[PDB]
Design an enzyme around this catalytic site. Sequence first.
Site, PDB file in Angstrom:
ATOM      1  N   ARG A  18       0.812  -1.209   0.000  1.00  0.00           N
ATOM      2  CA  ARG A  18       0.000   0.000   0.000  1.00  0.00           C
ATOM      3  C   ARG A  18       0.854   1.272   0.000  1.00  0.00           C
ATOM      4  O   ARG A  18       1.801   1.373  -0.804  1.00  0.00           O
ATOM      5  CB  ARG A  18      -1.008  -0.114   1.148  1.00  0.00           C
ATOM      6  CG  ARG A  18      -2.059  -1.182   0.824  1.00  0.00           C
ATOM      7  CD  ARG A  18      -2.947  -1.562   1.996  1.00  0.00           C
ATOM      8  NE  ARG A  18      -3.687  -0.437   2.565  1.00  0.00           N
ATOM      9  CZ  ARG A  18      -4.882   0.009   2.149  1.00  0.00           C
ATOM     10  NH1 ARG A  18      -5.501  -0.516   1.122  1.00  0.00           N
ATOM     11  NH2 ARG A  18      -5.464   0.995   2.791  1.00  0.00           N
ATOM     12  N   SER A  27      16.138  13.804   7.607  1.00  0.00           N
ATOM     13  CA  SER A  27      14.739  14.167   7.912  1.00  0.00           C
ATOM     14  C   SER A  27      13.883  12.995   8.265  1.00  0.00           C
ATOM     15  O   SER A  27      14.243  11.830   8.023  1.00  0.00           O
ATOM     16  CB  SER A  27      14.114  15.048   6.817  1.00  0.00           C
ATOM     17  OG  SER A  27      13.665  14.260   5.723  1.00  0.00           O
ATOM     18  N   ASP A  70      -2.953  12.415   9.192  1.00  0.00           N
ATOM     19  CA  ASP A  70      -4.329  12.173   8.787  1.00  0.00           C
ATOM     20  C   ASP A  70      -5.012  13.515   8.608  1.00  0.00           C
ATOM     21  O   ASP A  70      -5.166  14.247   9.561  1.00  0.00           O
ATOM     22  CB  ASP A  70      -5.065  11.336   9.843  1.00  0.00           C
ATOM     23  CG  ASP A  70      -6.457  10.911   9.401  1.00  0.00           C
ATOM     24  OD1 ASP A  70      -7.049  11.598   8.535  1.00  0.00           O
ATOM     25  OD2 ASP A  70      -6.977   9.877   9.903  1.00  0.00           O
ATOM     26  N   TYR A  88      -7.651   5.618  17.760  1.00  0.00           N
ATOM     27  CA  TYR A  88      -6.941   5.909  16.524  1.00  0.00           C
ATOM     28  C   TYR A  88      -6.670   7.440  16.413  1.00  0.00           C
ATOM     29  O   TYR A  88      -5.535   7.853  16.162  1.00  0.00           O
ATOM     30  CB  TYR A  88      -7.719   5.352  15.314  1.00  0.00           C
ATOM     31  CG  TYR A  88      -7.189   5.907  14.021  1.00  0.00           C
ATOM     32  CD1 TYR A  88      -5.983   5.438  13.463  1.00  0.00           C
ATOM     33  CD2 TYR A  88      -7.808   7.034  13.424  1.00  0.00           C
ATOM     34  CE1 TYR A  88      -5.422   6.041  12.312  1.00  0.00           C
ATOM     35  CE2 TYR A  88      -7.263   7.627  12.320  1.00  0.00           C
ATOM     36  CZ  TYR A  88      -6.060   7.145  11.759  1.00  0.00           C
ATOM     37  OH  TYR A  88      -5.540   7.741  10.626  1.00  0.00           O
ATOM     38  N   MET A 139      -6.787   9.775  18.729  1.00  0.00           N
ATOM     39  CA  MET A 139      -5.791  10.149  19.749  1.00  0.00           C
ATOM     40  C   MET A 139      -4.348   9.894  19.265  1.00  0.00           C
ATOM     41  O   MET A 139      -3.461  10.725  19.443  1.00  0.00           O
ATOM     42  CB  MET A 139      -6.074   9.373  21.048  1.00  0.00           C
ATOM     43  CG  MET A 139      -7.344   9.828  21.736  1.00  0.00           C
ATOM     44  SD  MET A 139      -7.900   8.749  23.056  1.00  0.00           S
ATOM     45  CE  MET A 139      -6.535   9.069  24.268  1.00  0.00           C
TER      46      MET A 139
HETATM   47  N1  LIG Z   1      -5.176   4.735   3.355  1.00  0.00           N
HETATM   48  C1  LIG Z   1      -5.707   5.957   3.645  1.00  0.00           C
HETATM   49  O1  LIG Z   1      -6.744   6.469   2.967  1.00  0.00           O
HETATM   50  C2  LIG Z   1      -5.154   6.889   4.694  1.00  0.00           C
HETATM   51  C3  LIG Z   1      -5.894   8.031   5.098  1.00  0.00           C
HETATM   52  C4  LIG Z   1      -5.361   8.847   6.094  1.00  0.00           C
HETATM   53  C5  LIG Z   1      -4.121   8.542   6.629  1.00  0.00           C
HETATM   54  N2  LIG Z   1      -3.424   7.421   6.228  1.00  0.00           N
HETATM   55  C6  LIG Z   1      -2.141   7.048   6.861  1.00  0.00           C
HETATM   56  O2  LIG Z   1      -1.155   6.731   5.914  1.00  0.00           O
HETATM   57  C7  LIG Z   1      -0.402   5.635   6.388  1.00  0.00           C
HETATM   58  C8  LIG Z   1      -0.483   4.515   5.378  1.00  0.00           C
HETATM   59  O3  LIG Z   1      -1.826   4.092   5.202  1.00  0.00           O
HETATM   60  P1  LIG Z   1      -2.153   2.625   4.649  1.00  0.00           P
HETATM   61  O4  LIG Z   1      -3.608   2.600   4.416  1.00  0.00           O
HETATM   62  O5  LIG Z   1      -1.182   2.171   3.613  1.00  0.00           O
HETATM   63  O6  LIG Z   1      -1.907   1.801   6.015  1.00  0.00           O
HETATM   64  P2  LIG Z   1      -2.370   0.306   6.367  1.00  0.00           P
HETATM   65  O7  LIG Z   1      -2.362  -0.483   5.111  1.00  0.00           O
HETATM   66  O8  LIG Z   1      -3.634   0.278   7.151  1.00  0.00           O
HETATM   67  O9  LIG Z   1      -1.214  -0.180   7.337  1.00  0.00           O
HETATM   68  C9  LIG Z   1       0.155  -0.110   6.955  1.00  0.00           C
HETATM   69  C10 LIG Z   1       0.952  -1.177   7.641  1.00  0.00           C
HETATM   70  O10 LIG Z   1       0.980  -0.870   9.026  1.00  0.00           O
HETATM   71  C11 LIG Z   1       1.550  -2.021   9.594  1.00  0.00           C
HETATM   72  N3  LIG Z   1       1.111  -2.296  10.965  1.00  0.00           N
HETATM   73  C12 LIG Z   1      -0.161  -2.393  11.464  1.00  0.00           C
HETATM   74  N4  LIG Z   1      -0.062  -2.740  12.784  1.00  0.00           N
HETATM   75  C13 LIG Z   1       1.244  -2.890  13.068  1.00  0.00           C
HETATM   76  C14 LIG Z   1       1.914  -3.264  14.211  1.00  0.00           C
HETATM   77  N5  LIG Z   1       1.186  -3.585  15.306  1.00  0.00           N
HETATM   78  N6  LIG Z   1       3.275  -3.270  14.195  1.00  0.00           N
HETATM   79  C15 LIG Z   1       4.006  -2.981  13.063  1.00  0.00           C
HETATM   80  N7  LIG Z   1       3.374  -2.602  11.912  1.00  0.00           N
HETATM   81  C16 LIG Z   1       2.003  -2.597  11.924  1.00  0.00           C
HETATM   82  C17 LIG Z   1       1.123  -3.251   8.720  1.00  0.00           C
HETATM   83  O11 LIG Z   1       2.252  -4.020   8.294  1.00  0.00           O
HETATM   84  P3  LIG Z   1       2.122  -5.626   7.915  1.00  0.00           P
HETATM   85  O12 LIG Z   1       1.176  -5.662   6.734  1.00  0.00           O
HETATM   86  O13 LIG Z   1       3.515  -6.002   7.610  1.00  0.00           O
HETATM   87  O14 LIG Z   1       1.531  -6.370   9.117  1.00  0.00           O
HETATM   88  C18 LIG Z   1       0.417  -2.614   7.541  1.00  0.00           C
HETATM   89  O15 LIG Z   1       0.676  -3.165   6.248  1.00  0.00           O
HETATM   90  C19 LIG Z   1      -0.921   5.232   7.764  1.00  0.00           C
HETATM   91  O16 LIG Z   1      -0.105   5.869   8.737  1.00  0.00           O
HETATM   92  C20 LIG Z   1      -2.326   5.800   7.715  1.00  0.00           C
HETATM   93  O17 LIG Z   1      -2.835   6.095   9.042  1.00  0.00           O
HETATM   94  C21 LIG Z   1      -3.940   6.589   5.274  1.00  0.00           C
HETATM   95  N1  LIG Z   2      -6.528   6.529   8.342  1.00  0.00           N
HETATM   96  C1  LIG Z   2      -6.183   5.313   8.008  1.00  0.00           C
HETATM   97  C2  LIG Z   2      -6.935   4.689   6.987  1.00  0.00           C
HETATM   98  C3  LIG Z   2      -6.550   3.436   6.626  1.00  0.00           C
HETATM   99  S1  LIG Z   2      -7.517   2.691   5.272  1.00  0.00           S
HETATM  100  C4  LIG Z   2      -8.344   4.070   4.425  1.00  0.00           C
HETATM  101  C5  LIG Z   2      -9.769   4.482   4.819  1.00  0.00           C
HETATM  102  C6  LIG Z   2     -10.360   4.014   5.993  1.00  0.00           C
HETATM  103  C7  LIG Z   2     -11.674   4.392   6.324  1.00  0.00           C
HETATM  104  C8  LIG Z   2     -12.391   5.226   5.477  1.00  0.00           C
HETATM  105  C9  LIG Z   2     -11.808   5.673   4.294  1.00  0.00           C
HETATM  106  C10 LIG Z   2     -10.496   5.312   3.964  1.00  0.00           C
HETATM  107  N2  LIG Z   2      -5.540   2.776   7.274  1.00  0.00           N
HETATM  108  C11 LIG Z   2      -4.835   3.399   8.302  1.00  0.00           C
HETATM  109  N3  LIG Z   2      -3.815   2.836   8.979  1.00  0.00           N
HETATM  110  N4  LIG Z   2      -5.179   4.658   8.626  1.00  0.00           N
END
Ligand SMILES: NC(=O)c1ccc[n+]([C@@H]2O[C@H](COP(=O)([O-])OP(=O)(O)OC[C@H]3O[C@@H](n4cnc5c(N)ncnc54)[C@H](OP(=O)(O)O)[C@@H]3O)[C@@H](O)[C@H]2O)c1
Ligand SMILES: Nc1cc(SCc2ccccc2)nc(N)n1
Lengths: 253, 251, 252, 253
Positions: D13, D140, D146, D159, D161
């Site tokens: 991802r 850096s 978020d 989350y 928090m």
């Molecule tokens: N996707 C979105 O729309 C979105 C929106 C707002 C913010 N963000 C932020 O952007 C970042 C990336 O998002 P994403 O959706 O790609 O994230 P994600 O797929 O939900 O999670 C990324 C990785 O976090 C690792 N992880 C989860 N729990 C863990 C633990 N206990 N210890 C070590 N690693 C752990 C997992 O690694 P493994 O698979 O190896 O277990 C997972 O693949 C995150 O910080 C997320 O909060 C994303």
């Molecule tokens: N803020 C996030 C999002 C995601 S998945 C993306 C998502 C989730 C709920 C509604 C819309 C989009 N994974 C992590 N670790 N942090």
Amino acid sequence: EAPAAVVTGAAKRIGRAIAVKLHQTGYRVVIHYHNSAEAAVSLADELNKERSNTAVVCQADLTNSNVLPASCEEIINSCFRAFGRCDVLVNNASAFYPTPLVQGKTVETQVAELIGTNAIAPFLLTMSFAQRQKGSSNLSIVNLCDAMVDQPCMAFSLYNMGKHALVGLTQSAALELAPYGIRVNGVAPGVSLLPVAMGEEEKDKWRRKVPLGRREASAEQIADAVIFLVSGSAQYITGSIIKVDGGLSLVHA
Amino acid sequence: EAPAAVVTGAAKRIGRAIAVKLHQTGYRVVIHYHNSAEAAVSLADELNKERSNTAVVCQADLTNSNVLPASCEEIINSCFRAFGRCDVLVNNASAFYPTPLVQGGKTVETQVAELIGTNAIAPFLLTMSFAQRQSNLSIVNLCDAMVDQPCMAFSLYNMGKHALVGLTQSAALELAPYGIRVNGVAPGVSLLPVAMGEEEKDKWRRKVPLGRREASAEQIADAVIFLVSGSAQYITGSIIKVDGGLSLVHA
Amino acid sequence: EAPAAVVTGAAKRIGRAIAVKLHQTGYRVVIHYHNSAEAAVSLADELNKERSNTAVVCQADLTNSNVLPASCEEIINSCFRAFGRCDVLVNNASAFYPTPLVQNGKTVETQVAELIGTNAIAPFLLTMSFAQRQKSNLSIVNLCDAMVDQPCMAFSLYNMGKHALVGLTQSAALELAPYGIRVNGVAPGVSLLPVAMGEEEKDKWRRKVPLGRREASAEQIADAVIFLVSGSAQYITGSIIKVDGGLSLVHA
Amino acid sequence: EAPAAVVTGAAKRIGRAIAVKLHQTGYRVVIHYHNSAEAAVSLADELNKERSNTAVVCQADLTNSNVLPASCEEIINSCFRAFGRCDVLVNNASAFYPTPLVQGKTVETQVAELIGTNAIAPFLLTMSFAQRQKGSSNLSIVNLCDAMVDQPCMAFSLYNMGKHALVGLTQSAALELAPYGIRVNGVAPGVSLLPVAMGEEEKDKWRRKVPLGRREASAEQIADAVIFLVSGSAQYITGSIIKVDGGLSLVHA
Ligand SMILES: NC(=O)c1ccc[n+]([C@@H]2O[C@H](COP(=O)([O-])OP(=O)(O)OC[C@H]3O[C@@H](n4cnc5c(N)ncnc54)[C@H](OP(=O)(O)O)[C@@H]3O)[C@@H](O)[C@H]2O)c1
Ligand SMILES: Nc1cc(SCc2ccccc2)nc(N)n1
Ligand SMILES: NC(=O)c1ccc[n+]([C@@H]2O[C@H](COP(=O)([O-])OP(=O)(O)OC[C@H]3O[C@@H](n4cnc5c(N)ncnc54)[C@H](OP(=O)(O)O)[C@@H]3O)[C@@H](O)[C@H]2O)c1
Ligand SMILES: NC(=O)c1ccc[n+]([C@@H]2O[C@H](COP(=O)([O-])OP(=O)(O)OC[C@H]3O[C@@H](n4cnc5c(N)ncnc54)[C@H](OP(=O)(O)O)[C@@H]3O)[C@@H](O)[C@H]2O)c1
Ligand SMILES: NC(=O)c1ccc[n+]([C@@H]2O[C@H](COP(=O)([O-])OP(=O)(O)OC[C@H]3O[C@@H](n4cnc5c(N)ncnc54)[C@H](OP(=O)(O)O)[C@@H]3O)[C@@H](O)[C@H]2O)c1
Ligand SMILES: Nc1cc(SCc2ccccc2)nc(N)n1
Ligand SMILES: Nc1cc(SCc2ccccc2)nc(N)n1
Ligand SMILES: Nc1cc(SCc2ccccc2)nc(N)n1
């Protein structure tokens, strides 16, 4: 001796509620208005029947122009003329309407109305309020802001610019007027009194968005936050903007 | 073929650095100026020496008035005339001076016109004209990292900058459907005023956590270049501080 | 019947003044404390002398741990056992000390536990327990920090805890609104200074404050809490009121 | 010689796209992962095929516990072991699930996982990163924040928090580490890659909310903001969080 307050746009709605609550708290009030002369006079009559010689009206247009500074000086002068003092200023009056970026008022009128009422008049009134404070004390200014300034209405750019400018004023004026003991705060409604001409269906669309009770703030609820900020319970509070929005601003799209 | 950009107040300082970097990136440029005709032309000559007919100048006062809308329409029109397109608008021009609230030159209403005009109303009118006249289209507004910790007795200036934040957000929302992105760059301390004495300059420099120095104009321009680029195609309504941590520093 | 409030870290300083003002406003109070048993008891004795059977004390460590959820449930339960209701929760208790990123006796995991526990996790668990017992003017007030975005050098864990508390205030306001539970914050700038802090250092902080070149009294902080739990704040939720004398507006 | 970066949660991802784009930019990369061993090793393989000896994997649980400091120290150590340097830390790994306030995992493990991954692990990694700096240079840290932290999803308190704590860390660490030439920033997605568990109708409901294009950000678009922040074009930028949200956070309820 009773303190005295100016409230802009106080003939009806939120402005009246604020005037009424200040009056109930023991203030003498200048009820400023623009077009709503009947409403303003009706309010002053009610307040004077409660306590004689405690309310006056004051007419002015708050659109920006080269005379706006004189007009704002005159509003403050009117409080001193009637009551001999001016302790509180509430910047409530506000023009509100869309100004789409892409497509009978000229754009320069729109600017003068929306930026003048929401920002320049507050600034000039603040100037005049401070300048007049010449020879315990509890002096303050409350600006009516907008809890949705960062999640604005589509096509309301000039309105939103004016409200953002008012936040700026609130902060700049708090800093600058602190040495004179004049506190400067804001109250930021979410949805309170909906527009009189808004249909009920549209009103309900807004009401349903509000987490706390699924209804708009009463005018009194907004007035309550104002009364707090002018009170002795807020004497260390300056440069603060209190949202009174029932959680509306916390709600994602 | 090449995209085209308008930079307001581009003759000197930050605006000049922005115009230069946009030109180096491959843009044709409209160099707007008010009083700095000599410097505006000297810049245009420099850019045109590099690539013929890729820089033009455009004079206008951005003070609010009855004629400001027409002025702003003409700045945008100048770009379309010279280059057949307008892809980027940079709202850089700015009046900056104090307006104390209490009294112990210019009238207060002239001050309102200049400070709110240059920092907010002209950006609004330019944004309107830019949008109406329409790919990677965007607008970048030069904001101020210190908007919430303002300098003493700068209320009008601060109000103008706050208004500009509101414009940035409101325009991002409204112009998103047209594919026009709208973002800001918020300097902390960059190029110090020419009239500031060296002692005061060093006082500001020493406040800056990251290197105890002011931002170069180039470093501000870098953020602009990022925002107008393909690397920022999902970014709108964002204001990027370029302040070396100054805004994080308590009293 | 009289409403009841839980105030955490209520033995001394700001928490004490909050407990006293709530009491003066007509609330029965649970005075939570960790180490200051003598001060907690002296306050409870004072309040019960004013109105019998209106104050009790509750001891608990609010450091994060496996048992913290139980401790937080028990604090809320203590209010119900004493008073038959719990209308107000004030999350006031707070560890506060530096945790430099690059280098007294504490391991870093203990520092995390203390700083994040007291300032964020315990408020969250207390909020859960408070809400779950709700089966009317119910509200929660979190003591935040007006300087959260201009933080003191080397206080990262403390600042992370206070930022987390802003997130809680917001998330809980949204989630608890349907239950009619309001959730707000009061954010002091500089209020009561440490008693041992030299006057020269105290005066350095005082001189920064635009409004009166002084720190907030505990009572001034308490006044904002009283407003927020009142009927004059019935539409106010998810709001954090700065009580800072303009300190946060002042540039470096 | 080539600089080196650690990216947490890099197997899939957003984290994967970040690792890939850093690698394309000339970085050697530590691909941290927790459960996604197969994907992590696969990515290391692909990057090493491009330039030999430029990628390694590093397994760790980033849940809060008494051993978390050691695990974080070990991640940074793994970058030095592989590459002799550590120039960039990207805190991307994140636990994300609801934790309703009113009534699987215990509440204590939910705290540990949500606050650990999103806040405490970043903090400990930041400590270890700074401490290991033995001493052109462009150090850096980028934290994945978020854009919806002030408009959170219902029942996501823990989350939210953690992500709020991460903003605090970004700001505090920027201030504290500036004297060492370590910049600390954030990238704040709105809606990017939707959860694999989310149903199609719901994905489309989220897409529809985005002003700019009515679509989610790609992982590559998020990685572009990271690339900028670590680059020489961001030399004066520290303590900044760049929203990459298509205007989503500007949209009222
Ligand atoms: N996707 C979105 O729309 C979105 C929106 C707002 C913010 N963000 C932020 O952007 C970042 C990336 O998002 P994403 O959706 O790609 O994230 P994600 O797929 O939900 O999670 C990324 C990785 O976090 C690792 N992880 C989860 N729990 C863990 C633990 N206990 N210890 C070590 N690693 C752990 C997992 O690694 P493994 O698979 O190896 O277990 C997972 O693949 C995150 O910080 C997320 O909060 C994303
Ligand atoms: N803020 C996030 C999002 C995601 S998945 C993306 C998502 C989730 C709920 C509604 C819309 C989009 N994974 C992590 N670790 N942090
Ligand atoms: N209502 C809400 O839900 C809501 C939401 C957010 C913020 N607010 C803020 O709260 C305040 C009060 O709201 P409201 O709805 O009660 O206000 P409103 O009814 O829209 O306007 C209040 C008054 O402003 C005066 N006004 C308008 N243009 C003027 C001008 N050119 N010169 C002098 N006065 C002028 C009018 O006085 P006359 O009638 O005498 O002409 C009018 O009665 C405003 O600042 C508003 O922006 C309200
Ligand atoms: N310098 C900093 O440390 C700093 C800090 C925070 C924010 N910023 C922002 O970054 C931008 C650039 O800053 P800067 O220091 O380079 O600006 P600046 O030198 O103060 O002003 C730039 C130009 O604005 C133009 N301008 C002023 N009044 C005008 C008017 N009435 N009509 C049309 N143009 C007018 C002038 O053009 P002519 O010379 O052609 O008359 C001037 O050269 C501004 O938006 C500023 O607020 C700068
Ligand atoms: N004072 C200020 O200038 C200022 C400025 C900004 C924000 N605030 C905030 O306002 C609130 C009140 O401040 P304050 O100065 O009065 O606070 P404080 O004196 O530093 O601490 C209040 C109480 O917190 C309790 N506490 C500490 N660690 C604990 C633990 N592990 N478990 C349970 N309780 C623990 C202690 O109770 P025991 O004594 O019983 O052990 C202590 O008396 C705090 O949330 C603080 O962050 C204060
Ligand atoms: N922000 C405001 C609002 C109002 S009327 C309240 C309203 C209008 C449209 C939609 C929802 C609620 N009047 C002024 N002057 N300023
Ligand atoms: N915000 C600004 C700054 C400048 S000059 C930079 C400066 C001035 C005072 C103190 C420190 C730095 N020019 C404009 N138009 N806007
Ligand atoms: N923000 C705080 C401060 C304190 S003690 C008061 C103080 C004020 C100013 C500088 C140093 C110490 N306690 C807690 N829990 N949180």
